[PDB]
């Protein structure tokens, strides 16, 4: 179901961190946690 | 015979929250008013006990649990809280009894170019039990495809690092937490405040 979307969301925050935007990488982390709890 | 809290509060290196650090405190007295009235604390939530009668009370055992988290997540270091930290890194029980103390350590734990010494766990197949510490580093299988122990597609390293930088907003800046547990169980009670 969400198999593809997760990977791509994960990749975002990983990329953002690489580009320096740490607060934004952390705000995506937060959203991945919330996204995987949402049943 | 003083309780060594400086080793906990005034300590040099703190633990990442997923591998929080626990110090046992027994057989000593403790001026708590020093802590409450050193007033260097963005947080001092206490539960099942009043932070002013702490000098009056005694307890069987004290534990001092310490670690770093960003400032947003400090709200989760309280009983009953859900969220990425209270779920996967450090959980407090409903019947908690003790205090929770945090202070901003932007000066200490932020670096230009990001400070990566501090990790958190983002993935976990289920919520932490209270005081459970999961320092595992297995690759997290998120989808139906085996990870064979290597990162990949829906196969993520479960620890993500904070990126502490001094130029973060106050919510993204590192906080040092100290959670004191006041164990009152059937025992002589060896840890006492400054007053009997
Ligand atoms: C840590 O040191 C400061 C001053 O250096 C002191 O005011 C504080 O009480 C100390 N912490 C403890 C737990 O004694």
Residue numbers in the entry:
A (entry chain A): 1 to 39
B (entry chain B): 334 to 529
Provide excerpts from the study.
We identified a 39-mer peptide region that was easily chemically synthesized and modified it to improve structural stability and mutation tolerance. The high-resolution structures identified the roles of the peptide residues and provided information on which residues to modify and how to modify them. The binding surface composing of G22 and L26 contributed to binding to both tyrosine and asparagine, whereas the previous A22 and M26 reduced the binding ability to Y501. Y501 binds more tightly on G22 and L26 than N501, which contributes to the nondissociation properties of the Alpha strain.
The spike protein of the SARS-CoV-2 binds to human angiotensin-converting enzyme 2 (ACE2) through the receptor-binding domain (RBD) and changes the conformation to fuse the viral and cell membranes, mediating viral entry. Here, we used a structure-guided strategy to engineer an inhibitor peptide with mutation-tolerant and potent binding ability against all SARS-CoV-2 variants. We named the peptide CeSPIACE (COVID-19 eliminative Short-Peptide Inhibiting ACE2 binding). For engineering, we determined approximately 2 Å-resolution crystal structures of CeSPIACE or its intermediate-stage peptides complexed with the RBDs of several strains, including WT, Alpha, Delta, BA.2, BA.5, or XBB.1.5.
